[PDB]
Design a protein around this ligand. Structure first.
Ligand SMILES: OC[C@H]1O[C@H](O)[C@H](O)[C@@H](O)[C@@H]1O
Length: 607
């Protein structure tokens, strides 16, 4: 290639008053971007022409980045998202406040809770009719009309930015809705856009792939195109063909346009399936990581204030690659979801076994520089127990455990369970944190004692997430202990999707009740706030500080350490017990032997 010609193509559209800083970043990161793209598309005859054209488009979008954001790009330090004050919140814009303008007016609520990172679930234009809660995207560059306009998105991010909140948006880059403009153009016979997807005339090629592919069929017959379209998920979601550079180019531009609208974090959905190769399982392929490296390089150049987050619900042993492998470590995703920890938390609770958490943390891969975890208790999906398959087999320190038993416990399919979840290998579990922790059952039985204990269980699980390196993510309503919403059952087109059980509309009346320390919502809210408050004052919890676990011979306890000055002790049983200091080498001070009441948690500055 001809580097100067490529650099010139990029520099062209830039504003001479902002060319210097941008070009400086281009000079240090462009080579990595080019190596990645060459590895993926370099053999194409159209490569050089496509590249020169795309870089020009990239430069033009770079120029359009609002000054306030360009300033953010220049002042924000790497690793910012892993600082102690970072606290996350995940919610649907419509369920939270109806529309984007509604969300903006509720920012004070988010500020009071200490939120500094807001994940709004799919808010871009989605497929007409069924669209899987917005995950079948029809336009990556426009907000769903029922939620507002792009102007409202800009007004929202500006307002959030003022309150010190970073917006995370989903970027469903593996597939689009089958009514996306590219899909419609394909349906109309435009070969150019038909090639943006994986299409086949007969089952000839599809079968070869199927031979090695795994069930999530993987193809859906479409009459309008008269071909089998690759559809890893719902039949109305067509997998994009990332082997086509035009697809990479247009999706990178879409990402940047979203960043220019104020999006600071990207949840990269279904990245494991980005690359297709016959003979393989077409999952977690080397090329998929190369795509993410290329996308990361683009942000490093154009919008370095932004972070890339891997949405790959897999065992923590398959997560390191997302932070970049080998020479590219630190040059891919900044964040990854610690699903193993999440599932382990619930398993440990149900089984009253802290040794399961010791196992998870003791084996948690150390975070690469400027990388961190997203820790959570619940989310918009069912709890996927299968991620714990490996841990469930046990090891030298932790005896095996039954994921089937854990799932049955939470589905209240076994006698003495306090859980009120619903079953969705081992089937996942739907239900809200308060419903799974025993709060719902205690309220339905008017049992005041069982309720207080249930509150302890809920707080315990969040305390664990809050002590982790990265961003602890609260699922909307957990801070008020909201329970299940069975309303979808009595609904037209929703009774088929069991996950709505844990996708309630925000209860603002309940939200106002947080000012009442004697109420349930207020009690939960107050205890979570206390943990958030303490977390923010502990430099030892920053993402660049070590994470480890001290092995204890009492299986009911879990000791998590951060750096060399912080220790968090947890009692996962319903019994009062104690931890001998001479077992964790301590004698420090208590934050906000050691006796732990049932389901108790204690934070200590061992130094
Ligand atoms: O493919 C569709 C799926 O994509 C992601 O996994 C979303 O988290 C999930 O809610 C959705 O159903």
């Amino acid at each position: 290639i001809d580097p100067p010609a490529l650099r010139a193509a990029f520099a062209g559209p830039l504003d001479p008053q902002h060319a210097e800083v941008l070009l400086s970043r281009y000079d240090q990161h462009a080579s990595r971007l080019l190596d990645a793209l060459h590895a993926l598309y370099g053999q194409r005859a159209d490569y050089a022409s496509w590249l020169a054209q795309w870089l020009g488009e990239v430069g033009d979008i770079a120029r359009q980045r609002p000054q306030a954001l360009q300033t953010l790009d220049s002042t924000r330090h790497a690793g910012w998202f892993g600082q102690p004050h970072m606290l996350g919140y995940s919610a649907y814009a419509d369920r939270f406040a109806g529309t984007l303008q509604g969300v903006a007016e509720r920012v004070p609520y988010l500020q009071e809770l200490g939120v500094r990172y807001l994940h709004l679930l799919p808010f871009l234009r989605a497929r007409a009719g069924d669209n899987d809660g917005g995950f079948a995207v029809s336009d990556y560059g426009q907000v769903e009309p029922s939620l507002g306009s792009n102007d409202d998105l800009v007004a929202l991010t500006s307002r959030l930015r003022e309150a010190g909140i970073s917006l995370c948006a989903d970027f469903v880059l593996n597939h689009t809705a089958d009514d996306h403009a590219w899909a419609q153009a394909a349906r109309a016979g435009d070969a150019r856009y038909l090639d943006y997807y994986h299409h086949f005339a007969d089952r000839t090629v599809p079968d070869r792939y199927e031979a090695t592919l795994g069930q999530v069929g993987n193809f859906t017959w479409v009459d309008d195109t008269a071909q089998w379209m690759w559809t890893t998920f719902y039949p109305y979601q067509w997998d994009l063909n990332w082997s086509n550079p035009a697809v990479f180019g247009d999706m990178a531009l879409a990402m940047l346009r979203l960043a220019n609208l104020g999006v600071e974090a990207f949840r990269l959905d279904s990245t494991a399936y980005l690359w297709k190769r016959i003979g393989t399982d077409c999952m977690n392929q080397s090329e998929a990581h190369t795509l993410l490296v290329a996308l990361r390089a683009v942000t490093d150049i154009v919008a370095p204030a932004v972070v890339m987050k891997a949405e790959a619900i897999v065992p923590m042993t398959q997560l390191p690659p997302y932070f970049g492998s080998g020479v590219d470590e630190g040059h891919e995703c900044h964040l990854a979801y610690h699903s193993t920890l999440m599932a382990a938390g619930w398993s440990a609770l149900a089984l009253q076994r802290g040794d399961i958490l010791h196992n998870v943390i003791a084996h948690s891969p150390p975070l690469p520089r400027h990388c961190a975890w997203l820790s959570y208790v619940r989310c918009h999906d069912d709890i996927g127990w299968n991620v714990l398959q490996h841990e469930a087999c046990g090891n030298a320190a932790q005896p095996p455990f039954s994921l089937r038993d854990v799932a049955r416990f939470y589905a209240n399919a076994v006698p003495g369970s306090y859980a009120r979840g619903e079953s969705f290998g081992v089937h996942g579990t739907n239900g809200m944190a308060a419903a799974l922790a025993g709060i719902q059952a205690a309220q339905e039985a008017g049992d005041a004692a069982a309720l207080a204990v249930a509150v302890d269980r809920l707080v315990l699980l969040y305390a664990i997430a809050l002590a982790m390196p990265g961003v602890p993510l609260i699922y909307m309503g957990d801070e008020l202990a909201m329970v299940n919403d069975p309303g979808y059952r009595d609904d037209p087109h929703r009774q088929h999707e069991g996950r709505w059980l844990h996708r309630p509309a925000m209860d603002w009346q309940l939200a106002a009740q947080r000012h009442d320390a004697k109420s349930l919502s207020g009690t939960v809210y107050r205890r979570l706030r206390g943990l958030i408050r303490q977390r923010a004052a502990l430099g030892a919890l920053a993402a660049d500080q070590a994470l480890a676990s001290i092995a204890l011979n009492d299986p009911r306890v879990f000791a998590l350490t951060r750096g060399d000055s912080f220790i968090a002790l947890h009692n996962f049983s319903d019994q009062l017990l104690d931890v001998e200091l001479a077992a964790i080498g301590v004698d420090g001070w208590t934050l906000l032997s050691i006796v732990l009441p049932p389901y108790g948690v204690r934070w200590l500055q061992r130094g």
